[PDB]
Amino acid sequence: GYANRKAIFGLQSCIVDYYRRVSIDTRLVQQLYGEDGLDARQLETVRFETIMLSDQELEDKFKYTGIQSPLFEEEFSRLKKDRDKYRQIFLNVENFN
Amino acid sequence: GFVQASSQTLVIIPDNERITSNVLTTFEATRLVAVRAQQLAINGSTMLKKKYSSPIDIAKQELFNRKIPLLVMRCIKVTPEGQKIVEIWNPREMGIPLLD
Amino acid sequence: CKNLPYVFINNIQERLQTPIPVYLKRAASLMRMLIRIELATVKTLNIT
Amino acid sequence: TIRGIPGIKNANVVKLMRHRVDAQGKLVRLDNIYAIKTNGTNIFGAMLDDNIDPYTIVSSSIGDTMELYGIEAARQKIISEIRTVMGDKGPNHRHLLMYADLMTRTGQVTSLEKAGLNAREPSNVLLRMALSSPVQVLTDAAVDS
Amino acid sequence: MAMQKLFTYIYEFIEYRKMVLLEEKVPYDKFVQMVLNTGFFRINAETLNHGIVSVFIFGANGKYVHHGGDMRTLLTNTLNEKKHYEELILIVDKPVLSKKNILDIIVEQRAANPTIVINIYPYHLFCINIPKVSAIPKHKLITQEEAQEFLGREYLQPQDLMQISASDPPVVWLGGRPGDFVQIERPSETAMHAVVIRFITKSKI
């Protein structure tokens, strides 16, 4: 009860505004609530398939070769960039924990 | 000293420059239904077609059938020069959340 | 996916194609990432 | 000091698992990695050692992290340290984000005590009166207008 | 081993801030010799806009950190030198930051010299490559025009944004001044990454 009452009085002024920001009457506390703008009751745990795959398993499963258009070279290239960026960010998070 | 704050002028953002969402929040829909149900408890004058025996059901059906005579004002900012910049939204043209 | 961050603004600006704030592009990055995996061409061949 | 770095009592050897990308692009969790979990914090002292990687020093102290790294690293440190206390039934990540973003919004780590409230919302007299001690807060409010 | 780390990462700091060195770099042994005998080491650098930035590394046992008269004299003569000064970095040991007299000379030299930025920093701020620390997100100064556009879209004032001190180590390595805006790209475990904009405020010392 001692820790609950002090946490609530320090945080109760944090309110979502019309930009989905969290502020104290004008002053930003978060640029976006939870950095994703979502409600915690509206979340589902979902696996991202490309994260663990190697460069060859990624190109085997997700690269489409039915049509020889430069679009699908770009579609797969965007899959690697998303895969690489996800790895880079969360490996760094693994570092400072 | 001058305790009385100076009067404000209501600056309505043009409809093509609105930044807030076109979907009503659950808070806004609940407030609209509660306000309209209280109005119906005052008057009872509605344009709803089907008969309902309680003000609340009339209010929910009016919201769902897009016949509610209310507007949502979202106060965006209070300029220290006196302007009160707001956004006016028509709930009859808005998305309606999952009120189940 | 390009118009995905307009979920955070409204459909009026999506129709007008106004610029999107950078912090709102970043907030749609996981959903952009997931849609490109689960709606890939190799996975949507039997979808009209 | 005869041996060791000041501030740390005991230094153990722990086994931990980390990920890494191979030359074939595969992400593999490596289990054969040995760390040193110390007893006591001195980020600067551990940093001066040539046997320790300075870019990956993980102190549990928020004040030590705030002093040496900054407010953005201290924000990530508050998140990590509340997570450790919460355990396995801990709350969603966005509730830890709410504590850290509040506690670091002024550029310094403020507390959830009456001192942190006075630092974040000084002019909110009624909020500060409700928390701890109205007569003292009321007296300063009247004097300060 | 603070001197050994400083001798490398102060030059890394100068390079990260995009300046050209003015003198020839001496080896580490004579660096320690000059720090011990002369009491300090002086490193000069030139900025793109021709500003001159001088960095003073003061030994922990030197006279300039124990006696305010020596520090006052040194700062007065260095600030009276006919150079296009824009920034002085005085790197002192951490306990020196708690000595009221030394800080009083610092603020009095600031008052006598209003157009020259005077900053005094501890040792550990230059014993790493601070930007490359894993726990430090990516900081980047943004222009006043971009910040004004962002604030106008958001109906915000610069005093509503989250604020960051000018003595924050990433901001120091950036060279951020009070009144500037720093965009921070930071990792997120909810959205995989986020962007915030902070308003740089006064240095604490």
- Tell me if chain D has a CB within 8 Å of the CB of A87: yes
List, as one string, the DSSP characters of A52-79. Answer: S--HHHHHHHH---SS--HHHHHHHHHH
What proportions of chain B, in percent to the nearest 5, are helix, strand and coil? 35, 20, 45
| A75 contacts: CB under 8 Å, gap ≥ 6 | A64, C36, C40, C41
Tell me which residue has tokens 């930025």.
E117
State phi, psi for E78 to the nearest 5 degrees. Answer: -70, -35
User: Which class for B43: exposed (0-12), middle (13-18), buried (19 or more C-beta within 10 A)?
Assistant: exposed
Q: Residue D81 phi/psi, 5° resolution?
A: -75, -30
**Rounded Cα gap, residues E122 and E97, in angstroms:** 7
Chain B residue nearest residue E157, CA to CA: B79
Nearest chain C Cα distance for residue A7, angstroms: 27
* CB-based contact D48:D95 (threshold 8 Å): no
Q: At what angle do helices E100-112 and E68-79 cross, to 10 degrees?
A: 20
Return the residue matching tokens 């909020």. D127
CB of C6 closer than 8 Å to CB of C14: yes
DSSP of C1-48: -TTGGGGGT-HHHHHHT----HHHHHHTHHHHHHHHHHT-GGG-TT--
Contact A95 D26 (CB under 8 A): no
Put the strands of the sheet holding E181-186 in their side by side order.
E138-142, E181-186, E194-201, E163-165
Q: Where are the alpha helices (DSSP H) in chain D?
A: 43-47, 62-68, 71-86, 93-103, 114-120, 125-131, 134-144
Q: Quote the minimal CA–CA distance from D2 to chain A in Å.
A: 30
By CB neighbour count within 10 A (0-12 exposed, 13-18 middle, 19+ buried), where does D95 fall? middle
Q: Taking a C-beta distance cutoff of 8 angstroms, is the pair D70, D107 a contact?
A: no
Our answer on whether B and C touch (3+ beta-carbon pairs < 8 Å) is yes
- Answer yes or no: are the C-beta atoms of C44 and A66 closer than 8 Å: no
Q: What is the resolution of this structure in A?
A: 2.6
Verify whether the Cβ–Cβ distance B74 to A19 is below 8 Å.
no
Among C21, C29, C33, whose Cβ lies nearest the Cβ of E153? C21
Q: Which chains touch C (3 or more CB pairs under 8 A)?
A: A, B, E
For residue D46, the distance in angstroms to the closest alpha carbon of chain A comes to 15
Chain A residues 15-74 within an 8 A CB cutoff of chain E: 19, 23, 26-29, 31-32, 34-36, 38
Residue type for position D1: T
**From CA B99, how far away is CA B61, in angstroms rounded?**
11
Sheet holding B83-89, edge to edge: B9-12, B83-89, B72-78
H-run or E-run covering A14: none
Set of chain A residues whose Cβ sits within 8 Å of the Cβ of C33: 48, 82, 86
Chains that contact E by 3+ CB pairs under 8 Å? A, B, C, D
Chains B and D, touching by 3 or more CB pairs within 8 angstroms = no
Report the alpha-carbon distance of residue D17 to residue D15 in Å, rounded.
Answer: 7
Question: Which DSSP category does D86 fall into?
Answer: H
